Amino acid sequence: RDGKLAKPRQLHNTLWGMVCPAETPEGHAVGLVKNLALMAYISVGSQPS
Amino acid sequence: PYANQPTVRITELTDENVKFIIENTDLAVANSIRRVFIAEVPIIAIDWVQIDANSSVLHDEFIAHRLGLIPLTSDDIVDKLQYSRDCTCEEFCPECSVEFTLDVRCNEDQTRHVTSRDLISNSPRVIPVTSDDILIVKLRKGQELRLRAYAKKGFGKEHAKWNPTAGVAFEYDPDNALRHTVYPKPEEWPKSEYSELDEDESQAPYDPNGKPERFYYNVESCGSLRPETIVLSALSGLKKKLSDLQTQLSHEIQSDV
Amino acid sequence: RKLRRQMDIIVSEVSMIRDIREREIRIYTDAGRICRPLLIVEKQKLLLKKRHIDQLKEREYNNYSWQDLVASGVVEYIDTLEEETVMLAMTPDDLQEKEVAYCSTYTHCEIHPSMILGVCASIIPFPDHNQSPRNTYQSAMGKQAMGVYITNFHVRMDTLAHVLYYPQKPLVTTRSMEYLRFRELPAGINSIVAIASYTGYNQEDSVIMNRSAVDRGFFRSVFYRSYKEQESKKGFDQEEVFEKPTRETCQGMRHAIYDKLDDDGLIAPGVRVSGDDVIIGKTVTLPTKRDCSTFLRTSETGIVDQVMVTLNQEGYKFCKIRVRSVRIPQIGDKFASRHGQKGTCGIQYRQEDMPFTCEGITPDIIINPHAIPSRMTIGHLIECLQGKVSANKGEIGDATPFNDAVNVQKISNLLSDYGYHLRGNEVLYNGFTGRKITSQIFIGPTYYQRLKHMVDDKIHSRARGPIQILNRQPMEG
Amino acid sequence: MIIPVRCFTCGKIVGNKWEAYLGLLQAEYTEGDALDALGLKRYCCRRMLLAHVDLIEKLLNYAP
Amino acid sequence: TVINNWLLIEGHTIGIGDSIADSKTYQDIQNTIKKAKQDVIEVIEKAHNNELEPTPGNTLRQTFENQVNRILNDARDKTGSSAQKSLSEYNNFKSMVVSGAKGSKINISQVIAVVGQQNVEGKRIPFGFKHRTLPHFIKDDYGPESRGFVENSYLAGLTPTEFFFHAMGGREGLIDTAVKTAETGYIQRRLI
Amino acid sequence: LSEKDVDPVRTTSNDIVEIFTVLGIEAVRKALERELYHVISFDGSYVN
Amino acid sequence: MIYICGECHTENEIKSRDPIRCRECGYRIMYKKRTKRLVVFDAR
Amino acid sequence: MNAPPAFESFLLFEGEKKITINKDTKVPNACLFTINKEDHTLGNIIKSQLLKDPQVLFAGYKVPHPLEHKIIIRVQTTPDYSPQEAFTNAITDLISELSLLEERFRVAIKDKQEG
Amino acid sequence: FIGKIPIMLRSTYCLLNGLTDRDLCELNECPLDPGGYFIINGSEKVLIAQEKMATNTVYVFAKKDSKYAYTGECRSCLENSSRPTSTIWVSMLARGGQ
Amino acid sequence: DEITPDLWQEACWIVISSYFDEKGLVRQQLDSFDE
Amino acid sequence: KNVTLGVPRLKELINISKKPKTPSLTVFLLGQSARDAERA
Amino acid sequence: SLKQRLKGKEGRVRGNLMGKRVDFSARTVITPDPNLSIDQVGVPRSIAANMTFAEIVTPFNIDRLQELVRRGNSQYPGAKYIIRDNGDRIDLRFHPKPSDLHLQTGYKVERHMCDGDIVIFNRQPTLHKMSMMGHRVRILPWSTFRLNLSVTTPYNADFDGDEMNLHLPQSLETRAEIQELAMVPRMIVTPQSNRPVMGIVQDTLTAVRKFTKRDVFLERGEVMNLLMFLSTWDGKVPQP
Ligand SMILES: [Mg+2]
Ligand SMILES: [Zn+2]
Ligand SMILES: [Zn+2]
Ligand SMILES: [Zn+2]
């Protein structure tokens, strides 16, 4: 439902340095499947105590 | 209406390459000679491999592929050797093939390089050219490669392994007097090693009456034949192609009438 | 900020965002936040100094690593939310250097702008000289190229595996490729590619391949198909076992030859197989015993590479059989460069037929000039020009995207030093006639890839085949 | 995986130059200098050794 | 068959030499782009100083964007025509365009002179960040560089920001192609 | 259409339903032609 | 009917009926030995 | 699966004629020579030798298909000269030239090897 | 004993943890293999990262079709407890109603 | 003292090389599972 | 200004709908207002 | 239930009547062939040797069809089956004994597809008439379908991995239908826009532009070479 409200296929400005701007499957999955940029890191989480 | 009277001036003759110039010839004859160098000069190459044991990291037809590409000395034996198809034997015999054997077992901690030096032939005339040696496969301790192969006659038109040349440099009109190539900017183009122009000059003046002549060759040999032997074989091979065609043409003309 | 940079109480992955206008400070510690390392800039200067670089140069035998840069407060991770409050410099040498004061409050700097690209886009050479969709197409094609997918591929038994005989590392490469190990496990070969209209067989994204080069192993590859079969004793009445069926023992057996099978019902390694052959002989006892042996597809024709016999997770005896099939490049096989220039092989010419330079060099691949103008893959032309300088110079060319030290003019000047036209054009002679071609052909080394899509895997015909019993309509048999 | 026997473009022998090429590099030769020492003049043959990856070495790290 | 065999003599290629232009042509393109940027700066100053009067049927923002876009659109055309005139009779980009075989005038200009303005949904690159297209610009930066105007050609290469904005503009083409494939034959099967 | 000083002849709408209920089916036939032609010829394409 | 152990590479003759397992290693992954039949390769 | 044997390009199968002559009815004194299992090596050399004949009005060759191994040589001669006669004289001249080239290349090899 | 957890290869709980490249080759493992996947019935399975909206954050959106002029949602989740996320909406009813 | 522009290209890729010496390319998957 | 075109507009015509996406008119003036901007 | 069997996109009425798999169809990758006519499609030997056309035995072709039966499946071109006047099918490869393989008028010999056979060639999506045109089969020695470069435009086909379907009409009546209605030359001009649907393309279009320039001059030898590729040439060399 969330994806319907706003189109996520478009390459958003904020993907810079986080998601590769070029790599995306062609076809029905354009812009929906993404790939991390080389130095992109996803936080594993920690306690805010 | 009749044949050209071509002349030959050999400029360099080593064990690897022969550089020569042919003059007073047509471009078609000059080109057909260089195509025969590559595609129609017979040599001897391995075209049959049975692998009795292969524990190496390369599969069987990887090894066979590498064996076929190993050049074998075929300078004088090739002429008297027969084609297996033409030979009447039971698919193989000394008159149409040369047997090879390779039996290498690695029993040492040091990696064993299976080279062409390990290829052993029953004919002393036909041996691997290198005997640095050509690497066939590297063997780890406990790995073995046991095979027997047959080397038969063939020319490069069938497979690139029977091509005796390691590069055929062909050239004509180095100064572009004929304007067979039009340079958008002649000044940007380096001079040919055969060029006879001054440093300031970039192109020879256009020769409207000129014809392609004085063709330059540099036939580099892989090792199977001597570079001079390739050219001599090519001229006789091309001559045999035409004489065969003439013989067939004569019968066809007779049948028509 | 100070605590995070000292790593005292605040871990590196904690993002603190201040919305000055909204009077809100948002601190995020949860997981799932995507962040990247950025160099910290203070007073229009990098906190990264020569001393940090020197210590990193002796990375080993020094215990100095990336973590010391983070601990030293020289680099920190910035997530997307924090990036909205960050004034970022693309480079230190240009952005925060004294100049017209566009901005004097840079807070961070990029380590290198080329890190925006991912794994597959990081092998594209000169991706900033290509039209963007072509970089997207290559990222797709790069995942379908052939090479050595993993070093221990002999031990593995995968349903499908393609291995190139002679993978090469690109002559022209990107700095990022050092970390993808693309050098260690390359997927492709450096091809002498001529951009010419030779005989019309490279038209409409088709390719003319050198038959002599193919004869020498050019883009030769292996195809491994692994078949797994397990025998299940479920059901008291039925008990399937591995053994070659015999006419007298089994009531019904196909006319296919079972000589290939061993006494254990499994074909031995090193045996040619085809459609008519049976690789696994499995017979199920009737409630004589019916046979349920496995057959190969008519298309496949290879040699049994490996036969392993084990007990699966369920504890049932099962065997994996790997069939080896060598795939020599032929007409219809797809080939691609690293710039979205994908095409099938239209025809193959022997070395004598191919056009040749004055040195006797014939291109391995000839591509149509009409592929470039629409796609605007100038990076393909620059890669060929750089690769020509690389092969002659003996140095691997650098095609990092946003490099000001490299440009076509600099590459062209280098090519002149080696006795070649500065723009990579050469005078080619017609292979058929030997006459000089009036136009000088752009020729040089380009990294090409063989794609998994072979024509043999695709060609298929149907002519009065095995219809379905229920529907009385065609079906695969 | 292993050095090709022939240069793809011209068929020149290259299979007996990988070990010498590695030896020359160990002798502080530049890659271009080593190729010139080995007789590789055409850039098609220089391509063969300059771009070769010798995976057979690591394949031998797995016991048969 | 007849001309495929004459082309064996004439030959046809394309290479780096066809993507280059004269140093004089490069200077002319640079002057046009340098002046075009200054023109956009002046339009920004008028808007900033409230000296920009909206045109009928458009708000102030639409008026500014229209004025900026025409300046940059004119600059691309001026540089594109200049690059085309520099081409010689021998140029292979021109030969394929002139015959109509492949490519167009815009392709030549992009390769040689300027890639041009990148648009998402018909507008310049949006302020996806907070009043910024990228974190590398100042807030409320309406200049050509900030909003997705590629001042370089494909031969010269794009800067990291231009590379990303060009990727943003190129993603729109990728999405549209996928939609058309989905829509392909839908109307036909309804009409039939 | 009824508004004064407004051409009651050339004035039209791009809504087929509005045309149908105001002018008729034959007006729709002509209006549908023009709408269908306009979309087809927008990009310069031609259909018989 | 020789099977090579995947762990110790021991060649052991195994019948169809008896369980598949290394005689001395105890390993449960067995590879068939290469066929004694001769297969011809053309070095093409 | 459809790959043809490499020898099919130069080996005649049973019942295949190396050369066949067909009269070209469009123009007088014209014949078509269909040579099997030949390529540009013999087509170009023969065709160029024919053009040196002043009695040969037209000489050309072609490979109808690269995947096939036939060359068609069309020769039109003057009324007093036969296309078959032109073809035979063309081959003899080529054989004469090639024989002369062999002799002179052999002499050159001796000269260079001698010193 | 309560069950078995599939283990991601080359992770701290994988057998190939801390093994040197030579050790990996002894185990017939490619040192260049990055790990990061699971072997499930012999199949190497990779878990694709799933992109979802951040929790505990107030987001104000506008829907034209719906009956609310604006809606400020907040998907609330505990600090690593009660995986289910409860979403609360605070919507301002549209002015369309007359 | 300070990294000059003539040394920046070498310096920045030493920083990048050290980053991949420590993290690799699938550190996200492994770190997530370890947690 | 902008109006629906291409497939979506083609879809609307064949899919005749009481509410098009971008309903609009084209009013023509038959008096002096046609040639007089102020009167228009 | 019975209602389920009919319902759905895969139901009998829709999934088995409006569209269905068909015999005597082939599909493979397409590659260029400038040496073929526009109305000619190159076909792999394996595809041709697998697909057959039933030829009614007549005294005109009694001997020719007899040879194909003798050659059989082993040798191409041969035949796969014999259908007697009874309508019963005989599998040739099982038993090649000529005694049981005598032919007579009224027999149908399912000979292998040969050169000149009419086929329907299709690229999907099939958007207009020119997406299913008729071609003459040309057996060629590799594993791809060949297309003249001009017919790529009507098919919207490219040689970068595209695959096209080959359908072989199986009777004289349907074979004559393709010849007189659906062959490529009859499709040159489309009624959609009353203009040609295929034209000259990349190399030939770029080269014909150069070829027709005012300063293109051809020597005697060159002209005789170009005339060898002019099938309609009347044999007279024009005055230079
Ligand atoms: Mg395609
Ligand atoms: Zn013999
Ligand atoms: Zn070479
Ligand atoms: Zn054991």
TrEMBL record, chain B:
Its main location: nucleus. One of its GO terms (cellular component) is RNA polymerase II, core complex. Keywords: DNA-directed RNA polymerase, Metal-binding, Nucleus, Phosphoprotein, Transcription, Zinc. Zn(2+) 2 binds at C89, E91, C93, C96. This is DNA-directed RNA polymerase II subunit RPB3. Core component of RNA polymerase II (Pol II), a DNA-dependent RNA polymerase which synthesizes mRNA precursors and many functional non-coding RNAs using the four ribonucleoside triphosphates as substrates. One of its GO terms (molecular function) is DNA-directed RNA polymerase activity. Disulfide bonds join C87-C96, C89-C93, C89-C96, C93-C96. Belongs to the archaeal Rpo3/eukaryotic RPB3 RNA polymerase subunit family. It is found in: Nucleus. NCBIfam families: PRK00783.1 (NF001988). One of its GO terms (biological process) is transcription by RNA polymerase II. Residues 189-212 are annotated as: Disordered. CDD domains: RNAP_II_RPB3 (cd07031). Zn(2+) 3 binds at C89, C93. PROSITE patterns: RNA_POL_D_30KD. Residues 17-248 form the DNA-directed RNA polymerase RpoA/D/Rpb3-type domain. InterPro entries: DNA-dir_RNA_pol_30-40kDasu_CS (IPR001514), DNA-dir_RNA_pol_insert (IPR011262), DNA-dir_RNA_pol_RpoA/D/Rpb3 (IPR011263), RBP11-like (IPR036603), RNAP_Rpo3/Rpb3/RPAC1 (IPR022842), RNApol_insert_sf (IPR036643), Rpo3/RPB3_RNA_Pol_subunit (IPR050518). It comes from Sus scrofa (Pig).
TrEMBL record, chain C:
It comes from the Eukaryota. One of its GO terms (biological process) is transcription by RNA polymerase II. It is found in: Nucleus. Residues 1-42, 66-113 form the RNA polymerase Rpb2 domain. Keywords: DNA-directed RNA polymerase, Hydrolase, Magnesium, Metal-binding, Methylation, Nucleotidyltransferase, Nucleus, Phosphoprotein, Transcription, Transferase, Zinc, Zinc-finger. GO terms for cellular component: chromosome, telomeric region; RNA polymerase II, core complex. The keyword Nucleotide-binding does not apply. Residues 120-477 form the DNA-directed RNA polymerase subunit 2 hybrid-binding domain. One of its GO terms (molecular function) is hydrolase activity. Its main location: nucleus. Belongs to the RNA polymerase beta chain family. RNA-dependent RNA polymerase that catalyzes the extension of a non-coding RNA (ncRNA) at the 3'-end using the four ribonucleoside triphosphates as substrates. An internal ncRNA sequence near the 3'-end serves as a template in a single-round Pol II-mediated RNA polymerization reaction. May decrease the stability of ncRNAs that repress Pol II-mediated gene transcription. This is DNA-directed RNA polymerase subunit beta. It comes from Sus scrofa (Pig). The chain holds residues 714 to 1203 of 1300 of the full protein.
TrEMBL record, chain J:
It is found in: Nucleus. It comes from the Eukaryota. Belongs to the RNA polymerase beta chain family. RNA-dependent RNA polymerase that catalyzes the extension of a non-coding RNA (ncRNA) at the 3'-end using the four ribonucleoside triphosphates as substrates. An internal ncRNA sequence near the 3'-end serves as a template in a single-round Pol II-mediated RNA polymerization reaction. May decrease the stability of ncRNAs that repress Pol II-mediated gene transcription. DNA-dependent RNA polymerase catalyzes the transcription of DNA into RNA using the four ribonucleoside triphosphates as substrates. This is DNA-directed RNA polymerase subunit beta. It comes from Sus scrofa (Pig). The lineage of its organism: Eukaryota, Metazoa, Chordata, Craniata, Vertebrata. The chain holds residues 141 to 175 of 1300 of the full protein.
UniProtKB/TrEMBL annotation, chain K:
Belongs to the RNA polymerase beta' chain family. DNA-dependent RNA polymerase catalyzes the transcription of DNA into RNA using the four ribonucleoside triphosphates as substrates. It comes from the Eukaryota. This is DNA-directed RNA polymerase subunit. It is found in: Chromosome; Cytoplasm; Nucleus. Coiled coil: none annotated.
